[PDB]
Amino acid sequence: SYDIYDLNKRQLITAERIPNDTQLIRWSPEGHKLAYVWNNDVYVKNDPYSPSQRVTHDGREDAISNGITDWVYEEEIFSTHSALWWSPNGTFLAYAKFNDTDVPRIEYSVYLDESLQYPKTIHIPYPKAGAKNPTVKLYVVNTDNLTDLEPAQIVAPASVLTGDHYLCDVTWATKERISLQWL
Amino acid sequence: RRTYTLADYLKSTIRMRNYNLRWISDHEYLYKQENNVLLFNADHGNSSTFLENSTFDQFGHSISDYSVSPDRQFVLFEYNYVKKWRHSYTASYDIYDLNKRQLITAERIPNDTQLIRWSPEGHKLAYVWNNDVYVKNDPYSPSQRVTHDGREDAISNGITDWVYEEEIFSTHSALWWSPNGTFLAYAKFNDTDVPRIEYSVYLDESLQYPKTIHIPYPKAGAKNPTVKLYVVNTDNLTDLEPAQIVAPASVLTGDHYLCDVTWATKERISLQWLRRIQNYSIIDICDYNESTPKWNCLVSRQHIETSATGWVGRFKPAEPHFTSDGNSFYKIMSNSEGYKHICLFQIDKPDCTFITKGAWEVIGIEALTNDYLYFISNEYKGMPGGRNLYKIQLNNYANVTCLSCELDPERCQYYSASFSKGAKYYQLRCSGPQIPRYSLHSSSNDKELRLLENNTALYETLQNIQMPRKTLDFLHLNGTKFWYQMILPPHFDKSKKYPLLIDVYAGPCSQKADATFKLSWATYLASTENIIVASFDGRGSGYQGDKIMHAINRRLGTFEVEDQIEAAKQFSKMGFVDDKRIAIWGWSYGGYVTSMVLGAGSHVFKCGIAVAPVSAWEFYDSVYTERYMGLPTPEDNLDHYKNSTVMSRAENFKLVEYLLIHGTADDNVHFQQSAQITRALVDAGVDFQAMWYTDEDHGIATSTAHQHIYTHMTHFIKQCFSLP
Amino acid sequence: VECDFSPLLSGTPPQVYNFKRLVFTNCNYNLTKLLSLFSVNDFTCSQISPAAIASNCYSSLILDYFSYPLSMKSDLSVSSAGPISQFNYKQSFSNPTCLILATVPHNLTTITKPLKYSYINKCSRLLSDDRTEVPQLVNANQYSPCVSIVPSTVWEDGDYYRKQLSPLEGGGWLVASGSTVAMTEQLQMGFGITVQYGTDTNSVCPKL
Ligand SMILES: *[C@@H]1O[C@H](CO)[C@@H](O[C@@H]2O[C@H](CO)[C@@H](O[C@@H]3O[C@H](CO)[C@@H](O)[C@H](O)[C@@H]3O)[C@H](O)[C@H]2NC(C)=O)[C@H](O)[C@H]1NC(C)=O
Ligand SMILES: *[C@@H]1O[C@H](CO)[C@@H](O[C@@H]2O[C@H](CO)[C@@H](O[C@@H]3O[C@H](CO)[C@@H](O)[C@H](O)[C@@H]3O)[C@H](O)[C@H]2NC(C)=O)[C@H](O)[C@H]1NC(C)=O
Ligand SMILES: *[C@@H]1O[C@H](CO)[C@@H](O[C@@H]2O[C@H](CO)[C@@H](O)[C@H](O)[C@H]2NC(C)=O)[C@H](O)[C@H]1NC(C)=O
Ligand SMILES: *[C@@H]1O[C@H](CO)[C@@H](O[C@@H]2O[C@H](CO)[C@@H](O)[C@H](O)[C@H]2NC(C)=O)[C@H](O)[C@H]1NC(C)=O
Ligand SMILES: *[C@@H]1O[C@H](CO)[C@@H](O[C@@H]2O[C@H](CO)[C@@H](O)[C@H](O)[C@H]2NC(C)=O)[C@H](O)[C@H]1NC(C)=O
Ligand SMILES: *[C@@H]1O[C@H](CO)[C@@H](O[C@@H]2O[C@H](CO)[C@@H](O)[C@H](O)[C@H]2NC(C)=O)[C@H](O)[C@H]1NC(C)=O
Ligand SMILES: *[C@@H]1O[C@H](CO)[C@@H](O)[C@H](O)[C@H]1NC(C)=O
Ligand SMILES: *[C@@H]1O[C@H](CO)[C@@H](O)[C@H](O)[C@H]1NC(C)=O
Ligand SMILES: *[C@@H]1O[C@H](CO)[C@@H](O)[C@H](O)[C@H]1NC(C)=O
């Protein structure tokens, strides 16, 4: 859970707060625009005192993740849970969409404190060698005019659409140019 | 040949049509036809079906109104309309996206929403909910709460209280968008210490216990609500608090009103303030200083308007109409001779320059461009009861060109106009004295493009009916010309003597005698019962100069009463009016005059009817009352507050037949007023008649109640005139 | 005789990239009678007016019909370079063309709706080099090559499709990506008219 502390007033912000159980959060490169992930959906806040704008609405645990990595991407590719990439001006937002719906899941037991009478089973989408890998899609959103023009997908190059593929890196060249590393 | 019976008036058997349109461009308007909403283009004559009536009933429920966004991307649908007062209500609103042609389901607009207004450009929304102002940059975008002190009967943000809606704004709205939509100006009202009127509501037979309705209602001299003006930047709403524009110092010497807020440019706002003693009005011109950033209201652009003979403006000071560059404006002001005419103001200049003059007034300013100014005046044929469209050349003020005078001079002498943006085209509306008419014109050559509605069906239907005639004539009282009208029975014979019935309003700046065509109750009496129904505009009337209008100042119930009697005495001198069968009736000020007339001891009138009358100025709201009568203090005008009560005249009611009507749910003219009359009539041994109408408001208008009161009054007059 | 518009009123309309076509010769048409069955939202014509298209004679008249959301109206301009006039549907410039966007009313029940509007937003080819991409821009009055690998209704926005070309067929890959727009309450459609003039065959005239 995250609180926002206003330095202009030197006071804590109490309205339009950031929900508990927030997974990710990233400021804009300039200014004070926020982007956070809650229940695997991407939300944007033009200002701390401003209501949240829900960008994606298909966030489902262990099936669809918007803006946060899945397991293999966090461990072996991104080395970070984040899949939000702000535009240098803060105008655009590039977010990633992962789909582990048919990715097999590993199950292991958790023997918590002596209070727990029955052991918990933990499920984690984990593609072993040759298993169904997650998909990834790249979408870009104009923060300043988010109301119209539902998110624009940047389709992968054709060289990589011959089969399964990964997304390794997203870098911003200029305020209107974006670079995507596919594999 | 058939006659205009009473059922013809009460059943709306003979319907009169009109043509109501909404200009949505400089050359396009919307019109509702067969429940469809058609989009007409006046530049080409082509029209498409903009909104099928199919998509009006296929939502879940009946839709009451609509308001299309200025960019024609979204439509607001109003439903669950619950009436509040004259202009107020609360309802639920849906947003219909026209780009997808689909209904919006997320970030909806809450139920019980009080107000809503689009931005002048684009698709931004501002609504009022629980007396707080909310803004939506887009229908698909969450609401941003601007104010958070919304308290019922204490604090209202963006909506007027009762007195402002009734007596000042004539609308519930207190939101003012800027032309770009960047800024929003909203008003905050505070009725915390304003006394409350309380009356019972006897709802459906199910309600075992009556409800008590409370309404902040300042009476004459009572505590008045305050108003503050705040402006908000929509584009960066989460940066600063709402910026208050403080009223000018001239108005801060005591209680004061805010009467108009107009936007000159995208960064300039104008505020019209009014003192509580309503002979002092001021315009403040405020620019947005992007530095601090504040609203810079330079003193050198304050503009004062005063009155030495009474109050300012007709009912309230005239609103300014700014030029395209907002560095000047034209507003109606009284000249030296006391005639409302158009004056030219420069924002920085301390004096104004009159561009029209004469022994006639300007009714209003209708449109404005860089070359011509359009307006309505009662100048033609020197008849004050007429209205015609004029235009002024802004280079040569001597070049005035009437646009409606010679179109149909016998049929149409009472015009009004609705213009488009930039005055490219204008809709002409004729109201009488013959059958109304509606036409579309282009301002480039002022030629009629097409005839929108001629009421031809009305014309032929009246051909088979012995319709009465309306005469516009005048008389002289102490050497002053005074106009009146007579509804004459069909087959009128000046050798025969008819009974006379006088219709009264006699209110300040009123006009009952005019060239307007109405299918009224008076139409029934003359056409069927052969009664002459007259109305006389004496002293205190308007549109004839501040001399005649301000004669009643601080003396309500003195000269407008005598002149109704004196004109009635003139009518008896005529050879066709029965001396012993003269009557009178009024409504909400006639009921005051009608009552005050019968108590004068004139021996002129045989009977009278007062419907929702005022009985004492101690009981009516301060805005209307203090404007003409001042404060009820022993130091200002308490003398005539007492000298002008109907109750002081009870003994003279022994000579006439009094019929007193009043609704119980009257929030405007409280039932307390009529009750005080009957107590004076009862305590004086005076017999009379009365009739209450339960849960009926001031303008008794429920179909069941509208038919009952007139069917009741018909029986009364026929019994007073000894008619079948 | 009478131009038979029956195929347009029966069944499920195809998607824009699989557009169905009605070719009309030697018949009599009443355009306004057909457009009176729909809720016509936009009517834009090129080299001809919407008033003339319903009242003139042509040697041959083509009518392409397909499902199309009104939200993407801006993309049905032949001048646009968007993933509709690039990969899905394009009208010819060499003859008068008209473009009609309609809405299927509630009382027109013989037109079934699909799950959603779909469209090809990428259709390119990968050569045997495995390095060179060649976008397959669609030509006028022809289908996109990628309709062999793009299904009649795209399952999910972003689904990609692939087919490996035999050496005779050029070698390499045929690659496409699809997108979707959510279905409206009333099915929104698009109509495309294209008229042609021949020597003696001026046999498509409005009836009397
Ligand atoms: C996330 O991934 C899952 C699985 O990879 C996607 O759902 C599956 O989508 C496929 C097609 O893309 C469906 O397979 C088959 O489609 C054919 C089309 O001809 C149909 O005839 C078969 O009956 C079958 O449905 C499959 O059913 C479906 N599985 C589900 C929905 O559980 C899903 O679309 C992906 N979502 C995103 C947002 O990427
Ligand atoms: C709305 O109007 C009410 C009353 O018109 C405002 O509340 C009242 O504010 C006055 C002062 O402005 C309070 O009166 C006295 O203030 C003196 C200051 O020295 C203090 O010593 C007294 O004890 C007394 O409080 C009055 O109490 C107060 N009445 C209330 C709060 O019921 C109110 O501020 C206005 N609100 C807005 C938003 O305009
Ligand atoms: C940040 O950069 C973006 C893109 O460079 C700006 O957006 C454009 O701004 C130019 C003016 O510099 C306008 O002409 C375009 O219409 C804008 N287009 C879009 C899509 O935004 C944006 O204004 C910049 N904002 C800030 C605060 O630097
Ligand atoms: C609407 O008008 C306002 C004020 O004229 C615009 O706000 C300014 O715009 C100018 C350029 O037009 C900028 O240089 C200023 O920085 C802006 N200041 C403020 C306080 O807004 C606004 O941009 C206009 N908006 C539209 C949509 O036309
Ligand atoms: C507006 O009206 C008020 C009262 O109706 C006027 O108040 C007078 O002010 C003068 C001071 O110059 C006093 O000597 C008078 O006694 C006041 N009259 C009353 C009845 O109190 C005020 O002058 C008027 N304003 C203008 C501009 O004419
Ligand atoms: C519009 O209605 C008016 C009636 O107000 C019609 O004018 C009358 O036309 C008859 C023709 O039979 C004349 O005898 C009357 O003298 C006319 N009366 C007036 C007051 O002008 C007019 O013809 C109608 N116009 C259309 C186009 O229907
Ligand atoms: C709806 O509009 C059509 C348009 O001609 C009309 O025929 C129909 O009577 C209208 N229905 C209603 C209920 O207004
Ligand atoms: C009228 O005609 C013009 C040009 O032919 C067209 O652009 C306009 O849309 C038409 N009016 C309506 C309401 O469609
Ligand atoms: C064509 O259809 C319209 C639509 O009502 C109709 O008005 C017109 O008479 C028809 N023309 C012929 C020749 O059938």
PDB file of N, CA and C in Angstrom, chain A residues 40 58-66 70 97-103 105 125 134-135:
ATOM      1  N   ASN A  40      -4.151  -6.519 -11.618  1.00  0.00           N
ATOM      2  CA  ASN A  40      -3.589  -6.784 -12.943  1.00  0.00           C
ATOM      3  C   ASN A  40      -4.190  -5.895 -14.026  1.00  0.00           C
ATOM      4  N   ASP A  58      -9.277  -6.361 -18.374  1.00  0.00           N
ATOM      5  CA  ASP A  58      -9.318  -7.818 -18.473  1.00  0.00           C
ATOM      6  C   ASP A  58      -8.344  -8.480 -17.506  1.00  0.00           C
ATOM      7  N   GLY A  59      -7.917  -7.758 -16.471  1.00  0.00           N
ATOM      8  CA  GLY A  59      -6.973  -8.288 -15.508  1.00  0.00           C
ATOM      9  C   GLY A  59      -7.525  -9.442 -14.696  1.00  0.00           C
ATOM     10  N   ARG A  60      -6.975 -10.635 -14.913  1.00  0.00           N
ATOM     11  CA  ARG A  60      -7.381 -11.838 -14.201  1.00  0.00           C
ATOM     12  C   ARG A  60      -6.132 -12.555 -13.713  1.00  0.00           C
ATOM     13  N   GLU A  61      -6.128 -12.931 -12.436  1.00  0.00           N
ATOM     14  CA  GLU A  61      -4.949 -13.543 -11.838  1.00  0.00           C
ATOM     15  C   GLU A  61      -4.602 -14.851 -12.536  1.00  0.00           C
ATOM     16  N   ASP A  62      -3.313 -15.030 -12.827  1.00  0.00           N
ATOM     17  CA  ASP A  62      -2.752 -16.219 -13.464  1.00  0.00           C
ATOM     18  C   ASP A  62      -3.298 -16.463 -14.867  1.00  0.00           C
ATOM     19  N   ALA A  63      -4.059 -15.520 -15.424  1.00  0.00           N
ATOM     20  CA  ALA A  63      -4.402 -15.554 -16.842  1.00  0.00           C
ATOM     21  C   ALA A  63      -3.920 -14.313 -17.580  1.00  0.00           C
ATOM     22  N   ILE A  64      -4.301 -13.119 -17.133  1.00  0.00           N
ATOM     23  CA  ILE A  64      -3.994 -11.880 -17.839  1.00  0.00           C
ATOM     24  C   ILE A  64      -3.351 -10.901 -16.866  1.00  0.00           C
ATOM     25  N   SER A  65      -2.206 -10.349 -17.258  1.00  0.00           N
ATOM     26  CA  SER A  65      -1.509  -9.329 -16.486  1.00  0.00           C
ATOM     27  C   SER A  65      -1.219  -8.151 -17.404  1.00  0.00           C
ATOM     28  N   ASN A  66      -1.653  -6.963 -17.000  1.00  0.00           N
ATOM     29  CA  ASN A  66      -1.373  -5.731 -17.725  1.00  0.00           C
ATOM     30  C   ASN A  66      -0.400  -4.887 -16.912  1.00  0.00           C
ATOM     31  N   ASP A  70       4.907 -11.586 -15.745  1.00  0.00           N
ATOM     32  CA  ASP A  70       4.637 -12.885 -15.152  1.00  0.00           C
ATOM     33  C   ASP A  70       5.943 -13.401 -14.546  1.00  0.00           C
ATOM     34  N   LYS A  97       1.067  -6.787 -22.061  1.00  0.00           N
ATOM     35  CA  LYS A  97      -0.048  -7.660 -21.711  1.00  0.00           C
ATOM     36  C   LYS A  97       0.393  -9.109 -21.840  1.00  0.00           C
ATOM     37  N   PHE A  98       0.398  -9.824 -20.719  1.00  0.00           N
ATOM     38  CA  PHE A  98       0.829 -11.212 -20.660  1.00  0.00           C
ATOM     39  C   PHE A  98      -0.383 -12.119 -20.514  1.00  0.00           C
ATOM     40  N   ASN A  99      -0.297 -13.308 -21.104  1.00  0.00           N
ATOM     41  CA  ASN A  99      -1.416 -14.243 -21.125  1.00  0.00           C
ATOM     42  C   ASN A  99      -0.907 -15.649 -20.823  1.00  0.00           C
ATOM     43  N   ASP A 100      -1.089 -16.090 -19.575  1.00  0.00           N
ATOM     44  CA  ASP A 100      -0.660 -17.410 -19.124  1.00  0.00           C
ATOM     45  C   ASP A 100      -1.831 -18.376 -18.993  1.00  0.00           C
ATOM     46  N   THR A 101      -2.863 -18.205 -19.822  1.00  0.00           N
ATOM     47  CA  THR A 101      -4.089 -18.972 -19.631  1.00  0.00           C
ATOM     48  C   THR A 101      -3.851 -20.463 -19.843  1.00  0.00           C
ATOM     49  N   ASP A 102      -3.079 -20.825 -20.867  1.00  0.00           N
ATOM     50  CA  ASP A 102      -2.759 -22.220 -21.136  1.00  0.00           C
ATOM     51  C   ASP A 102      -1.333 -22.585 -20.725  1.00  0.00           C
ATOM     52  N   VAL A 103      -0.670 -21.731 -19.950  1.00  0.00           N
ATOM     53  CA  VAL A 103       0.658 -22.034 -19.419  1.00  0.00           C
ATOM     54  C   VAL A 103       0.495 -22.981 -18.236  1.00  0.00           C
ATOM     55  N   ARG A 105       0.990 -24.841 -14.728  1.00  0.00           N
ATOM     56  CA  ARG A 105       1.322 -24.239 -13.446  1.00  0.00           C
ATOM     57  C   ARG A 105       1.920 -25.284 -12.515  1.00  0.00           C
ATOM     58  N   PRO A 125       2.118 -20.086 -12.710  1.00  0.00           N
ATOM     59  CA  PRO A 125       2.344 -20.414 -14.095  1.00  0.00           C
ATOM     60  C   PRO A 125       3.843 -20.488 -14.383  1.00  0.00           C
ATOM     61  N   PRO A 134       3.953 -18.084 -22.180  1.00  0.00           N
ATOM     62  CA  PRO A 134       3.036 -16.942 -22.208  1.00  0.00           C
ATOM     63  C   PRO A 134       3.197 -16.140 -23.491  1.00  0.00           C
ATOM     64  N   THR A 135       2.128 -15.455 -23.870  1.00  0.00           N
ATOM     65  CA  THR A 135       2.186 -14.465 -24.931  1.00  0.00           C
ATOM     66  C   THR A 135       2.447 -13.089 -24.325  1.00  0.00           C
TER      67      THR A 135
END
